[PDB]
Amino acid sequence: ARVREYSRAELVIGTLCRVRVYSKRPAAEVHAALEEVFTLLQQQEMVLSAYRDDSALAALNAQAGSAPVVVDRSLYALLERALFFAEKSGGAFNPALGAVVKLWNIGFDRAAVPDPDALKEALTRCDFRQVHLRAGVSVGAPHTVQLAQAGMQLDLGAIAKGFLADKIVQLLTAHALDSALVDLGGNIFALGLKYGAQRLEWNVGIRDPHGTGQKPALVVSVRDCSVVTSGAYERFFERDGVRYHHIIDPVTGFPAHTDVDSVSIFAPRSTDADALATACFVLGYEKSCALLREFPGVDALFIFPDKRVRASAGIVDRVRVLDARFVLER
Ligand SMILES: Nc1ncnc2c1ncn2[C@@H]1O[C@H](COP(=O)(O)OP(=O)(O)O)[C@@H](O)[C@H]1O
Ligand SMILES: [Mg+2]
Numbered sequence: 001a002r003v004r005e006y007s008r009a010e011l012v013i014g015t016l017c018r019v020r021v022y023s024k025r026p027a028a029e030v031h032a033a034l035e036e037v038f039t040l041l042q043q044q045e046m047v048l049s050a051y052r053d054d055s056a057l058a059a060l061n062a063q064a065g066s067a068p069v070v071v072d073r074s075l076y077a078l079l080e081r082a083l084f085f086a087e088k089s090g091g092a093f094n095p096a097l098g099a100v101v102k103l104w105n106i107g108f109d110r111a112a113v114p115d116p117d118a119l120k121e122a123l124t125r126c127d128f129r130q131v132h133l134r135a136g137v138s139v140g141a142p143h144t145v146q147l148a149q150a151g152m153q154l155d156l157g158a159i160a161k162g163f164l165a166d167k168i169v170q171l172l173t174a175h176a177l178d179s180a181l182v183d184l185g186g187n188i189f190a191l192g193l194k195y196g197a198q199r200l201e202w203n204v205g206i207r208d209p210h211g212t213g214q215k216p217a218l219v220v221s222v223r224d225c226s227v228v229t230s231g232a233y234e235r236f237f238e239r240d241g242v243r244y245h246h247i248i249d250p251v252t253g254f255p256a257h258t259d260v261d262s263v264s265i266f267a268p269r270s271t272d273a274d275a276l277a278t279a280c281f282v283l284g285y286e287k288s289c290a291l292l293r294e295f296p297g298v299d300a301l302f303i304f305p306d307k308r309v310r311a312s313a314g315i316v317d318r319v320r321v322l323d324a325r326f327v328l329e330r
């Protein structure tokens with residue numbers, strides 16, 4: 001039995017999603033797994049999407065201030081994990097920020113900053129503690145979500161790609177695959193080891209925060225690990241000489257003013273890496289290090305505006321700088 005390498009990529013969930021697999025299984029089995037990966041992404045776009053009228057999440061948001069809504073176990077679990085990171089991060093990551101994000105989402109389209117009072121009003125409808133998750137303990141009991149605060153809106157943009165990368169890994173493993181690189185718009189999961197007959201760690205690239213995005217500035221060698229990056233120049237618009245990026249500080253209702261250009265989180269679960277990358281970007285370097293002490297199983301890599309790079313002890317020896325303008329502090 002020979003090793004073969006496969007990849008497939010499609011535009012779905014608003015970005016380019018690519019999965020690369022090495023396998024000795026019959027090619028038909030790999031093709032079937034990849035078919036299911038991309039069917040899953042299509043289906044989940046219709047569950048999780050914040051910017052569509054026909055998604056399950058949009059239906060949930062339409063019931064804010066009303067009765068609990070039945071959701072499937074998967075969406076319930078994702079919301080539970082999102083609220084966990086909201087609590088642990090002091091709301092730096094906030095999955096109920098839709099009232100504010102939606103104003104900024106039209107801002108992007110219109111290239112215009114939201115009004116002050118409108119923005120001040122939106123911040124009053126973002127209390128994630130008023131998302132009530134309930135699930136009965138008896139056999140087959142439904143899972144429900146209630147948005148108790150009038151006009152509050154869920155937006156899972158900062159955790160959905162991580163969730164989907166984890167769901168894809170679970171699917172690949174269900175198909176008896178153990179070597180893959182999952183890349184959902186840059187949200188990476190490195191499953192197992194790649195092939196060279198030699199088995200090698202995956203060399204995951206981290207971009208220059210200001211890069212055209214072509215070349216990575218650094219690579220990190222990893223196995224069975226998600227690598228998720230949140231950064232200041234990945235999505236933004238400009239107006240009158242000021243840049244407004246897409247990661248909001250919930251305290252100000254404005255794009256976060258932070259001391260790092262990007263934060264990359266390395267974790268066994270991409271859900272966790274995605275939520276933490278957002279929280280850490282909002283919190284800034286020192287407070288991020290404090291938060292991360294609560295998660296011993298994760299590592300982090302910070303790129304500063306002066307091109308210094310700091311990486312935690314669990315990954316620093318695995319980092320290689322490719323763009324010599326950057327310096328890895330040791
Ligand atoms: N502080 C925040 N907490 C949670 N979600 C946020 C926050 N700010 C913005 N969002 C939503 O999450 C998205 C940012 O997600 P993030 O994972 O940080 O970046 P990326 O889009 O590169 O994956 C935004 O587009 C918005 O939908
Ligand atoms: Mg995130």
Ligand SMILES: [Mg+2]
Binds near residue numbers: 157159162187228230
């Ligand atoms: Mg993300």
Ligand code: NA
Binds near residue numbers: 230
């Ligand atoms: Na990103």
Ligand code: NA
Binds near residue numbers: 257
């Ligand atoms: Na800040």
